[PDB]
Design an enzyme around this catalytic site. Structure first.
Site, PDB file in Angstrom:
ATOM      1  N   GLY A  90     -26.784 -54.391 -70.583  1.00 23.35           N
ATOM      2  CA  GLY A  90     -26.257 -55.502 -69.816  1.00 23.35           C
ATOM      3  C   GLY A  90     -27.329 -56.264 -69.066  1.00 23.35           C
ATOM      4  O   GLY A  90     -27.200 -57.475 -68.883  1.00 23.35           O
ATOM      5  N   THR A 114     -21.671 -58.755 -77.057  1.00 21.13           N
ATOM      6  CA  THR A 114     -21.149 -57.593 -76.278  1.00 21.13           C
ATOM      7  C   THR A 114     -21.983 -56.369 -76.637  1.00 21.13           C
ATOM      8  O   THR A 114     -22.942 -56.468 -77.398  1.00 21.13           O
ATOM      9  CB  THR A 114     -19.669 -57.272 -76.629  1.00 21.13           C
ATOM     10  N   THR A 172     -23.954 -59.713 -72.450  1.00 23.90           N
ATOM     11  CA  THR A 172     -23.239 -58.523 -71.991  1.00 23.90           C
ATOM     12  C   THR A 172     -23.272 -58.393 -70.478  1.00 23.90           C
ATOM     13  O   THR A 172     -24.303 -58.645 -69.837  1.00 23.90           O
ATOM     14  CB  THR A 172     -23.806 -57.233 -72.611  1.00 23.90           C
ATOM     15  N   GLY A 217     -13.955 -48.442 -80.242  1.00 24.24           N
ATOM     16  CA  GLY A 217     -14.465 -49.607 -79.552  1.00 24.24           C
ATOM     17  C   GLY A 217     -14.613 -50.719 -80.571  1.00 24.24           C
ATOM     18  O   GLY A 217     -14.768 -50.450 -81.764  1.00 24.24           O
ATOM     19  N   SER A 231     -24.316 -57.434 -79.682  1.00 22.56           N
ATOM     20  CA  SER A 231     -25.575 -58.105 -79.412  1.00 22.56           C
ATOM     21  C   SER A 231     -26.554 -57.281 -78.557  1.00 22.56           C
ATOM     22  O   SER A 231     -27.752 -57.581 -78.503  1.00 22.56           O
ATOM     23  CB  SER A 231     -25.295 -59.447 -78.734  1.00 22.56           C
ATOM     24  N   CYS A 251     -29.447 -58.046 -72.239  1.00 20.86           N
ATOM     25  CA  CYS A 251     -28.610 -58.938 -73.054  1.00 20.86           C
ATOM     26  C   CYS A 251     -27.830 -59.966 -72.255  1.00 20.86           C
ATOM     27  O   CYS A 251     -27.019 -59.640 -71.368  1.00 20.86           O
ATOM     28  CB  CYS A 251     -27.616 -58.150 -73.915  1.00 20.86           C
ATOM     29  N   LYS A 301     -12.986 -53.583 -74.237  1.00 23.60           N
ATOM     30  CA  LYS A 301     -13.561 -53.337 -75.558  1.00 23.60           C
ATOM     31  C   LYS A 301     -13.330 -51.937 -76.118  1.00 23.60           C
ATOM     32  O   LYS A 301     -13.594 -51.689 -77.296  1.00 23.60           O
ATOM     33  CB  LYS A 301     -15.071 -53.604 -75.527  1.00 23.60           C
TER      34      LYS A 301
END
Lengths: 393, 173
Positions: free
Chosen positions: B156, B1, B162, B45, B124, B159, B33
Site C-alpha cells: 500500500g 489493488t 492500493t 480474494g 498491481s 503502490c 476484496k
C-alpha cells in the site's frame, strides 16, 4: 399397527451401514403416514407428507435407504432423474410421467403380489381337476351317506400316486394358467394399485441439485427451473391422468436427493423449498465403512458371492484381513481416480473373484479361502496402475 | 489493488486492500476484496470486478459442491468454464483462493497456478507484497496473519493503486 421409528431404523440397519440420520429421517416420514390415518377427517386432509431432501455424495446410501424404506412399507416405489426433464426443451418428456410410471409399477406389483398369493390354491384345485379326470364320482351322493360316502379312498392314493409320480403335469400347468385367471378380479385390481399409489407412493427424485440456478446463462436456468415448476403440482397436490385411472399426488411421499457441491438447497425454487420441509445430510463412507458393507448387511455382496459359489459346490471363505484388503483397494482406487462410493466395492469384489467364478464348477467340493494373500495377488497391481484402474476398476 | 495470501503452520490467510480506482481518482476506499466461501471452509480474494468476482466465487463454490471439495480439481474445473463460456470468458479478474489443503491462483486464461510456498501476491501491488512477504517468511517467525498484513501495508505504501484498508480472512487446522 405399523412399526415405530426405532423399529423402522432397525430394519433399515439390516441393509444399510451408517447414515443414521437419514434413516431416522426417512423413518419419521413413514411413521407419520400411520399417525395421519389415526386422525379425524378434517385433519386427515390438512396433514401432508413431510417430504425429505437428502444431501450427500454418490453411492453412500441415499437411494438404498429410499428403496429399503419403500420395501419395508410394501409401498410402490419409483426412482427418477431430475435432469431427464430439462431435455423437454427439445422434446424430453413431461413430469406427469413420474406418477404414471409410478402407477404402472404400482400395478405390476398388485398383480404379481396377488397372482403369487394364488399360484398355490390354483395348483391344488388344479389337481382337483385332474383327480376328476381319473375318478369322476361327482354329483350328489353315489353310495353311502357316512362310511361309503367318502369317495376319497381310491382317489386319495390316486392323486398322491400322481403328485409324487395330455400328461398329468403337462395338463396341470395348463389348468394352472386356467384356474388362476379364472380367479383374478381385474376391476378392483385396477383400483387396488391406485389406492396404493395415492396412500403409500414413494417417489425418489435424484439430481435435484442439477435443476438449480447458477449464474450460468438465461437459457439453461430457464430449462432447469422449469423442471422445478413442473414438479410443483406433483408435490403441492394435484391429479394425474393414469393409463389405469386418476391419481391424486396429494399424499405421495417425495424424497429428493442432491450433492449440492455446486448449488445450495436455497437456490431451489421457493415453492419447492416449502415442500421439502426435511433436510438431512449423509456422510462419505470410510474404509471401515466399506469393510462393514462387504459383510454386515444380511444379504451383503460377500454373502451373495458365497451363495452363488455354493451353487457350484464350492465353499468360499473371506478372511478378515481379506475383507480389509478388499475395502482398502476400493478406497485406494476411488481416491486415486474418481470416488464413486460403495459402488467401487462391486467392481473390485467382482474382478477379484473372476478366476474362481470361472473355475468354480471345476473346484466342485473344494474349500477356497480368499485371504489377504489372494486379494493382494489379484488386485494390488491393477489398483496401482492408475490408467488401468480407470478401465478395469 | 493488492491481495496477499500466506500460509504458515496451521494457518493460511488472504488479505486485500480496499481501494478501487478509476482514472487517477479513488472511486471507493473500503472495497471488500476478501471473503469466505463453501460454508466458511474456503477463503478467497479477488482483484477486479466487485461483481465479476461475485459471479466467479459462486460458480467456484459450485465446483466444490459436487467434486467432494477437492480445492485443486474444482479450481481447474472453474478456469475451464471460465476460459470457455462467452459469459464467463467476458469477465476479467484475478482469483486467489486458499483452504486447509493448499492455496492457488486462478485466471481467465484458464490458468491454475500455485506459487512456491503457497505464497500469493496478485494485483498491481502483488510484487511489493511478495518481496516483503518474503523478507519476513524468510527471516522471521511471524504468523501467517502478521506477514500477510505487514506485507500488505508495505505494498500500500509503494503502490499508488492500493490503500491501507484491510480485509483479512483466516483458516486454522
Amino acid at each position: 399397527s405399523e412399526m415405530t421409528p426405532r423399529e423402522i431404523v432397525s430394519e433399515l440397519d439390516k441393509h444399510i451401514i451408517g447414515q443414521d440420520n437419514a434413516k431416522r429421517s426417512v423413518a419419521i416420514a413413514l411413521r407419520n403416514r400411520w399417525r395421519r390415518m389415526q386422525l379425524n377427517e378434517e385433519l386427515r386432509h390438512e396433514v401432508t407428507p413431510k417430504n425429505i431432501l437428502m444431501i450427500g455424495p454418490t453411492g453412500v446410501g441415499k437411494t438404498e435407504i429410499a428403496r429399503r424404506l419403500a420395501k419395508l412399507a410394501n409401498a410402490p416405489f419409483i426412482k427418477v432423474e431430475a435432469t431427464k426433464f430439462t431435455e423437454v426443451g427439445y422434446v424430453g418428456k413431461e413430469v406427469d410421467s413420474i406418477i404414471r410410471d409410478l402407477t404402472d409399477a404400482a400395478v405390476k406389483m398388485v398383480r404379481v403380489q396377488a397372482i403369487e398369493k394364488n399360484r398355490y390354491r390354483a395348483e391344488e384345485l388344479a389337481e382337483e381337476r385332474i383327480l376328476d379326470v381319473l375318478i369322476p364320482p361327482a354329483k350328489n351322493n353315489w353310495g353311502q351317506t357316512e362310511q361309503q360316502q367318502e369317495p376319497s379312498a381310491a382317489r386319495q392314493a390316486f392323486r398322491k400316486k400322481l403328485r409324487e409320480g395330455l400328461k398329468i403335469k403337462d395338463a396341470m400347468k395348463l389348468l394352472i394358467e386356467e384356474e388362476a385367471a379364472k380367479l383374478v378380479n381385474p376391476e378392483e385390481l385396477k383400483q387396488d394399485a391406485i389406492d396404493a399409489v395415492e396412500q403409500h407412493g414413494i417417489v425418489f427424485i435424484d439430481e435435484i441439485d442439477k435443476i438449480c440456478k447458477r449464474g450460468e446463462s438465461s437459457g439453461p436456468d430457464v430449462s432447469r427451473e422449469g423442471v422445478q415448476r413442473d414438479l410443483l403440482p406433483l408435490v403441492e397436490g394435484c391429479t394425474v391422468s393414469t393409463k389405469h385411472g386418476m391419481v391424486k399426488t396429494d399424499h405421495i411421499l417425495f424424497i429428493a436427493s442432491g450433492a449440492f457441491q455446486i448449488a445450495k438447497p436455497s437456490d431451489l425454487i421457493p415453492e419447492l423449498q416449502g415442500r421439502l420441509p426435511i433436510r438431512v445430510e449423509l456422510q462419505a463412507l470410510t474404509t471401515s465403512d466399506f469393510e462393514r458393507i462387504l459383510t454386515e448387511p444380511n444379504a451383503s455382496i460377500t454373502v451373495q458371492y458365497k451363495a452363488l459359489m455354493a451353487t457350484e459346490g464350492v465353499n468360499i471363505e473371506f478372511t478378515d484381513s481379506g475383507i480389509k484388503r478388499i475395502a482398502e483397494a476400493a478406497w485406494q482406487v476411488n481416491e486415486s481416480t474418481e470416488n464413486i462410493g460403495a459402488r467401487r466395492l462391486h467392481t473390485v469384489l467382482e474382478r477379484l473373484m473372476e478366476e474362481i467364478s470361472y473355475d468354480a464348477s471345476d473346484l466342485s467340493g473344494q474349500n477356497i479361502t480368499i485371504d489377504a494373500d489372494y486379494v493382494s495377488k489379484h488386485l494390488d497391481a491393477l489398483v496401482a496402475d492408475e490408467d488401468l484402474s480407470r478401465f478395469i476398476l | 489493488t493488492t491481495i496477499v495470501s500466506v500460509r504458515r503452520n496451521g494457518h493460511v490467510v488472504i488479505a486485500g486492500d480496499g481501494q478501487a480506482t478509476l482514472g487517477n481518482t479513488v472511486m471507493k476506499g473500503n472495497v471488500k476484496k476478501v471473503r469466505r466461501l463453501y460454508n466458511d471452509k474456503v477463503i478467497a480474494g479477488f482483484a477486479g470486478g466487485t461483481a465479476d468476482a461475485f459471479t466467479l466465487f459462486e460458480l467456484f463454490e459450485r465446483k466444490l459442491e459436487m467434486h467432494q471439495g477437492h480445492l485443486v480439481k474444482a479450481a481447474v474445473e472453474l478456469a475451464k468454464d471460465w476460459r470457455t463460456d462467452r459469459m464467463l470468458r467476458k469477465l476479467e479478474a484475478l482469483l486467489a483462493v486458499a483452504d486447509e489443503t493448499a492455496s492457488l491462483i486462478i485466471t481467465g486464461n484458464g490458468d491454475v497456478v500455485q506459487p512456491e510456498n503457497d505464497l500469493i501476491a496478485i494485483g498491481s501491488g502483488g510484487p511489493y507484497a511478495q518481496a516483503a512477504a518474503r523478507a519476513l517468511l524468510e527471516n522471521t517467525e511471524l504468523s501467517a496473519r502478521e506477514i500477510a498484513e505487514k506485507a500488505l501495508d508495505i505494498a500500500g505504501d509503494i503502490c499508488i493503486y492500493t490503500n491501507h484498508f484491510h480485509t483479512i480472512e483466516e483458516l486454522s487446522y
